[PDB]
Write a protein that binds this ligand. Structure first.
Ligand code: SF4
Lengths: 273, 270
């Protein structure tokens, strides 16, 4: 009823919080919208960072249409510039309970008027806690055939033990979630004083991890502090609350944008078989 | 146990893993060594980065003395250089359990380490404040003489918005009666190889004011230097366009840890 015209649903996964998985979701969304797709982002990771905060709409009023909730507009579609619309909904609008809280969460998600949508990215909570696993089942239960394109697993090179990406991958295999690929966030550094991107500790090992699972490796994302500034203050990056509709335009000046453009283009060829 | 001649025991604490705690412990050890103190390091943090691997003694064969394990010598004292001996002992020396049994073995392992004469014993604890880890802290409190346990150093990250992490450590230190030597805000900024320019975009004093609001010492701010990692990994001296303790003198982090160490020493002996 709510997702009946959403073409592709992608879950953004993590075995542990603190990997910047909500940053990854934000930039996947912006990049897909820069490629001309209509993008939705559903945030059900109430522990992790606020996705509406990153889109500078954390103070927006969720409008109510006849029979549902209208997602918050980050920016409208723009044919002349070839960018698609971008809309967001947060579980924090609905919100200390047990199974009844799962039932309310499921009703709420089924109440969002997503309308036509090329891609709906889901910011899922980290880890496979019994509370989270049932929510993951809920999505699968309400998903329709062919719709769930699969999952994107976000990790870091820094993790000595990959038991959480091993865990999230194993859960995906166990439940049939297709793994579209793994993203290695915070692998290297881009900085303002000069554009040189460096990771002298190159072997983050996340790629061999992707080999061990015969699973796709979408690429490495460096830290760019000008991205965090852009999200926080709205300042456009330069290389030697903010207005939300300007974000996608300022993002193509961020050094991370060409990286996510390539990650996006490969995610799209994977989902479209 | 066998703390019979350990003058000062410092706990390095953390609300959660991945904050660079084991590396902070590593550099406190090197700095205390460069200041002429004999130093031991007890790694009881299995989930974190292997501290033996940091000191480049991960392939050592630990020996058995008089009813217990003998610590591995990273380097011995050198009065000429003014550096002191540096020993490490970790579980990763002896493993190629979960639940209460895991912590039982870890408590028994701690009991079985023969430390002998020592100015400072640094203890790399597992993060968090679970009841298991509390039991580890309680054991140390019992085997420690009234002046022996100097206090706890709490490592935190400015990027993390979970300040309460800090709080549950200093609440727990005050609940167990463990002095708080200070807070170290790690991963605060980033030094770069292409030029020694440190970049930091967080509050630039947010950890300072938060430690003031808690009435706890603020020991200082430590940025990320990837050349420290390549030195730990390949022995390459950090350049900024023999022994680890001496090569580390060329790492930008070393003057930072000289000042932090010095403040800790003043706090300890008063
Ligand atoms: S400008 Fe270049 S050399 Fe300076 S910190 Fe940034 S990356 Fe490093």
């Amino acid at each position: 009823m709510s997702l009946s015209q959403v073409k592709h649903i992608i879950l953004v996964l993590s075995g542990k919080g603190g990997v910047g998985k909500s940053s990854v979701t934000t930039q996947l969304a912006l990049s897909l919208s820069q490629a001309g797709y209509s993008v939705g982002v559903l945030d059900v990771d109430l522990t992790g960072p606020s996705i509406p905060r990153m889109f500078a709409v954390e103070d927006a009023k969720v409008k109510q249409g006849s029979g549902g909730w209208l997602p918050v507009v980050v920016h409208e579609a723009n044919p002349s510039t070839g960018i698609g619309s971008l809309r967001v909904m947060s579980l924090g609008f609905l919100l200390w309970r047990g199974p009844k809280k799962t039932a309310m969460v499921r009703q709420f998600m089924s109440d969002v008027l997503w309308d036509e949508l090329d891609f709906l990215l889901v910011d899922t909570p980290p880890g496979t806690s019994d509370e989270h696993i049932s929510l993951a089942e809920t999505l699968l239960q309400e998903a329709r055939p062919g719709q769930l394109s699969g999952a994107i697993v976000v990790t870091t090179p820094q993790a000595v033990a990959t038991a959480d990406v091993r865990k999230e991958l194993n859960f995906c295999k166990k439940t049939g979630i297709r793994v579209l690929g793994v993203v290695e966030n915070m692998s290297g550094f881009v900085c303002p004083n000069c554009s040189e991107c460096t990771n002298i500790f190159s072997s983050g090992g996340g790629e061999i991890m992707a080999n061990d699972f015969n699973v796709r490796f979408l690429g490495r994302v460096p830290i760019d502090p000008q991205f965090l500034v852009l999200i926080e203050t709205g300042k456009r990056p330069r290389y030697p609350t903010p207005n939300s509709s300007l974000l996608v335009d300022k993002y193509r000046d961020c050094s991370l944008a060409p990286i996510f453009r390539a990650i996006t283009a490969d995610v799209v060829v994977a989902v479209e078989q």
